[PDB]
């Protein structure tokens, strides 16, 4: 008899092995909490946020169970914003400490179980780099690293091969008087594009990822990806205003802008950046992360960065829907979700933020009863939440000051230094004069007023991210929505085989009743709460035919029942799943068969 | 001669222990100083204690030493050989299952079922050289390939560097028919368990100049992880030898009891619950038997009474203290 | 010592397996002889060509050392012309036989040692498809078939959604009276172009794919591939003539076609059928080959349909280029070569064909006396020389003929029927009245008669393809172009451990001398001729410096020497190679390592 | 009792000539239903054989037949022992390494030093039932995979189709310490050979419904071609097993000079070479054994007489018909 036993233990041990699903990577479980460099934490004291204060504050991080950090581009830049122009990608600026305080904080990170992402722009560079001061004497093989191309160029003013007009500003084609040739920038006028159709430009940016990716940085995320490659065709662009008359066409929103945006040989260029990193992501545990991040641009041209069933290119593009958004309501907010979860590629993995460092605070853009609200529905996605600095707790966006450095008027709100403290400039420094005057509200404001006192909008941020690690029906499980309406949106997930689903409602109206016996069926006379969007009614009762909610009210109700939505033939067409398992309560494992 | 009994101890003293250990000695030392210091004074407490067994040995020839004498014969039976017999098959479980989750621990009840069945598998075969030379090789290459690369709390760190050296007092018993034991086996153990030291020590510097010592801690496998770090292309070998010498090292009713009852060891207990509860008893009679000798000495005693009132087990004593003694 | 001597034989064959370079597949070795189905042979006496026809003289085809017949496109389409708009993808016309008469076909091939290869019109299909007449009445899943768009058609004429013209007439979009919405089609009036951006259109050409492969049609060949996908913003096209007036562009030439041509995501529909096919080519002699086939184009577009060095798109592009040439010269042929060995990705395999169906053919466009030297540039060249039927002797086109089938005036030249004996229509049908007359100087020129003379333009296409096959250097050699002339074309193959290159020398000139001596260094006092592009002359003595050559005259010199060009410093940047080997006189084997 | 001498037989009969017949015996028939019938000629005419031996063994006991006997000891010496020990070995060397070259046949200068690597290593190991086993597994997988996708020149076919039916000459010898001879040994003939007769054609008819009979010329290995084509994904377990066993089934002085001179059978001669060399001087003693019994019977007699007159090879003539009228 135990010979026969013996085997139907390898038998079962080899079926759980071929059973068991691939288990979430780093950046599939886990939220982000994207931190500004400059506005994060001061160490040396001179007014400017530098890397040995991230290091500092390292221990705040995890307390937010944060899984990657991805820091804001820190490269030493002529031009700190309009899309960071680095000058030198193997170096550091002076600001931010060195390049032996980064590999302090890296290894710091990788301690304390946390990963980082640092941005990376390969689409252009800076005036002051050695490669666009070789290119204008035409020296070796960096003569044609940049879009050259011959303009007339007489005593008064510059004529352009073509109307294509910058992001930021007019007449994309500059003339210099060493090369006496117009260079292709198409962002600034010291942003010349780096000419990506050269085979030795295209294996420069091989070296500098895999320069960084030695230090540990743990992947990369690309910032200009659609403006890589143009048309070989200097032709004019088609104007919006067809009876318009030229020598006039100055903005770039009055353009179709069809040869320097998305071209034919652009993806591929993103699918070569992804099979260099997969030289570093041989090791089990060290995987590299890509993101694309496409901003102003449709949903169908965003979903292209997941890649196809045959070929990886990224694992995500960053969502940017989310945070245009300034009035929301339950349309609004219902059409974003679904657009990003009808659109994508079945199996990929989806993600969400709210704010950014281009966007408004989101008490400035929503108001101060939309804080609570909001941070729910990230983390209550399947997506992996990605918050920005100073975003778990509510931070208003401050007035546009006259800085004496070329940084954008606009934007700029959301650079403002974390509060941490109640003392001089809210404890980010204990310098004078900082770059960036605090913004005034910060003795009520800051992180550790918010700890002290209970039901504040700290400790919401706190025990989501631990009901999202810790309970498996948020990490990966299905999402069913329930219709659609304009004053409260809900949706169900849930997961076979765990007997429990997880109800989560959110008003975005004015203050309006919901009855939650006309939207999903099987609902007991009474439910619990778990953690609200004002942290003193958890644990209450509420019966579904009739609750009371505010208005920026949100709640999460937990009921037992093995009636998942997902199973009935209604609700087949608003469910989706990334990863389909099931879950076995007597056996604690994971099951793809089930 | 001297060289062939040299190289037998070798053999016997260098297991599928010093793979295993340092994920435990250093989740105890905290360190990498101390935790080659704690290596270090396992080593030389395993020689002392090996060349006082040689002395011990060759003049009395369960031998060593009433009721003594009965209870050792009791706890060889049930805590003893049982016990060691499933710590060694949970460690081939443990390793033949680890590069098939990467990223994740294994679970509990995959580990447990195949080290179940490799208990069954073992009494069966037994009821009816190549593992050696195949771990001297991983034992090889990961020294060789880690040097062209480089140039309460504290009895716990014991208990799991000291399961390295797993088979130092049973050196005297397949080294007396060699030749003269007059000066050849002491010698072969003041030069062959330093020589495994200094082994061991060359071996667990590999690991840390490869990866960080915060990964140690989340690696059930140290040695999985170090072959895809290193030997990128071939990363394979490394698993499947160890695996297939651990499996090597692992009387009718004296099997069968011993493999009954190591699977109910298994279930209540993990790798880690296990190292300690068997250093414990196995250390409390060695105590006992240096003990009998006094009525090197002066050093092996107050070592191993700090070995056993550190960690003062519950579920220890009620066993080998009060199993036996409502029997006799 | 026998101990040791056992294992240093196992340590040889673990090297030699591990040193032996892939075998070349059966698309890389042999040439093409592309086969008109409908002009090549007629069995059952009706007067069109027919797939038996094909079977009877599959002798003649093996005696030419052809390796695969790739057969132009044989469905049942209401229009034979115009890029083959297709009916019924699943059904052959009753023209080349039925069903049974296919299966006979390639299993009588498979007989033989050949391969097979059908064309493959996945843009379009025809307005009698069973999918565009359920797509009239909006029946089902078809309702989005195709690209529809809702047009004003009032009392007089219709108004298209955009200034988009078709390739062979006005107006790319028609309106019907049935659907009352207008159809892109952009090749005729009853060929509507098939939207791919539906994904159950792009899966219904997954199952026409699967179809043919059961059937062992051993490879595909795309015919439009840059015609599948459009803009999706119907916007006007650029025009040539800006100062052009409107309501006048009426011809494909004067527009740019930068919204209906080779637009985003189109490669990946081409990346996606090759996918489908690796499924079916999992056994290790069974390979698919796909051809893209995309004519009238850049060089560097062409060569984007090769594949990326770590996703596989297509064997090789088929080279359009060397047809189109009507006045060939020492120049314009170089130019050529050299355009598609410069911009190819390295480890391709290139490929070359003189004429084809669309194109005139080349005693006709070149002249009697072009034949032999342009048949031996095809089989001294390191792609896969493709041969069209009727090409391997000298066949010339015949006047336009009034036919009552929708055919193309132009382009039809070419399809004049296989002259094979002297009786009748050639002896190409029995019949009487065939579809095409056959050409009028068929009693010189045909198989039989070019047979049994010597020194003919038959003999000349055996033994060249003989010793493509027999010799190595021709099969996967070097090819090192010796400078540029206006008057004679010089390249030299040659392979590392053979101690013996190939010379290869063609005039395109008006009877000049050349001089060996100032090309190529270290060439003996006297050197032989293997082939000599005129026959009789093989096996003679020449010297090098002072070579008598005709107009169209062709030579090949095999030297002996280990001097290979290609070693040099100054033959670095002209030598070129796709699969790098070293040959081994001793062990007769194929080396990576030398 | 009966079905232990029947599974006896059948093990001693199913050899490593299975798929390495095919290939020779289609390139001389031309055909699939004439080779299908020269197999059935062939199992049928092996029955007999072992048939009528068993009557001839069991009454006698070169024990069978002076000069005749010399002449059979010669000859197994040289030609019948060491040349199909050859032929075991290239077909276990053109099965080893099929797989490497998947497009293309594989080169004659690997197959022959490996096959020479494989001699050398055997004839070491050999002077110093697993492979049974894993050998009826490829012959019922072929047969079974086969049934759930189905529902001069004549000479040398049974050449090649006869040396799958090797061991039918030598089955008197293992057989006589099962039972009693009476009605065991003739029974377990007459329905265990024709047994492997139909399990022969039943694996055959497993080739030509996957591959057509084109492809089969063109396939050095008809088993490593059969086992991508229909078990795609576990495609690596055919050419594995049938080289395992094949190893298995190919005295110091003895194999010394059997591996010495079989080393030089394989430079000038191929692997069809061979089997027409073997097959002529085995056949050629087979034939002057049933000659010296006599001294059914009607046909046995004009087809006997047709298998030697039909091929009547250089160096052949000078070892049979040179080098013992030297000697005698
Ligand atoms: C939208 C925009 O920036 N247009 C710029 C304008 O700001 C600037 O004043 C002018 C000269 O500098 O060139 C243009
Ligand atoms: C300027 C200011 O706000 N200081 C307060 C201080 O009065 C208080 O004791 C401390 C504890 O919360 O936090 C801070
Ligand atoms: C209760 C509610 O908001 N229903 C809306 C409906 O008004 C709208 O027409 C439809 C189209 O988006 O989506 C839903
Ligand atoms: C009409 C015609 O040309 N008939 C000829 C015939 O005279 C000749 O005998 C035969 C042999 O080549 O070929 C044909
Ligand atoms: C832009 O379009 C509008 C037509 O709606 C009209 O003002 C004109 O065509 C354009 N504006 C100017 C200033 O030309
Ligand atoms: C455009 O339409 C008219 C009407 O049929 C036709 O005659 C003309 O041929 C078309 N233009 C071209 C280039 O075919
Ligand atoms: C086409 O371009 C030329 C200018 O070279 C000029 O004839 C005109 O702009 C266009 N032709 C017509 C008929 O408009
Ligand atoms: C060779 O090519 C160059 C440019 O294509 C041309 O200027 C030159 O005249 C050519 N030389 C000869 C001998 O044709
Ligand atoms: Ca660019
Ligand atoms: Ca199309």
Known sequence: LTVASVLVLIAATIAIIALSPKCLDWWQEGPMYQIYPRSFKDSNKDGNGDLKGIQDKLDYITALNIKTVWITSFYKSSLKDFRYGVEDFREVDPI?????????????????????????????????????????????????????????????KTIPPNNWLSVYGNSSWHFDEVRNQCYFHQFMKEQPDLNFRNPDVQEEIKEILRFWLTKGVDGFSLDAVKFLLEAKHLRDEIQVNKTQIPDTVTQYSELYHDFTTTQVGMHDIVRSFRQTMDQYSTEPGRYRFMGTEAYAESIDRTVMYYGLPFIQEADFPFNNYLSMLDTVSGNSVYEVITSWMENMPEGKWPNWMIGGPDSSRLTSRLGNQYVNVMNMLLFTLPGTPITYYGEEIGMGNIVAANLNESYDINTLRSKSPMQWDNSSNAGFSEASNTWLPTNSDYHTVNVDVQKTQPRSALKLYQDLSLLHANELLLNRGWFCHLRNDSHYVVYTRELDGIDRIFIVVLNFGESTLLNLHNMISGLPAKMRIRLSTNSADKGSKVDTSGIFLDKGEGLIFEHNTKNLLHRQTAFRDRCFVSNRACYSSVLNILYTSC | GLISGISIIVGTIIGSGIFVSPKSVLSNTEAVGPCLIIWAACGVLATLGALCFAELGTMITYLMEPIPAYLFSWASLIVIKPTSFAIICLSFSEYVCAPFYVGCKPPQIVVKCLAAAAILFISTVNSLNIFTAAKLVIVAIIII????????????????????????????????????????????????????????????????????????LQSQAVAVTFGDRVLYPASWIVPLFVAFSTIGAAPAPAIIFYGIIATIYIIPGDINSLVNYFSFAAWLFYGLTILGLIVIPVLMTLISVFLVLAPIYLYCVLFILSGLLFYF
């Open chain 1, 96 to 156: 931010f400490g060195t390049m032996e305080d980064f590999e302090n904080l890296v290894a710091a990170i990788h301690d304390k179980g946390l990963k980082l992402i640092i941005d990376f722009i390969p689409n252009h560079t800076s005036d002051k780099h050695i490669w666009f001061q070789l290119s204008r004497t035409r020296t070796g093989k960096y003569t044609d690293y940049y879009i050259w191309h011959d303009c007339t160029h007489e005593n008064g």
């Open chain 2, 145 to 216: 390939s880690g040097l062209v690369l480089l140039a309460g709390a504290i009895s716990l760190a014991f208990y799991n560097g000291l399961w390295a050296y797993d088979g130092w007092n049973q050196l005297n018993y397949i080294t007396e028919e060699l030749r003269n034991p007059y000066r050849n086996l002491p010698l072969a153990i003041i030069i062959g368990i330093p020589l495994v030291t200094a082994c061991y020590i060359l071996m667990n510097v590999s690991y840390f100049t490869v990866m960080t010592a915060t990964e140690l």
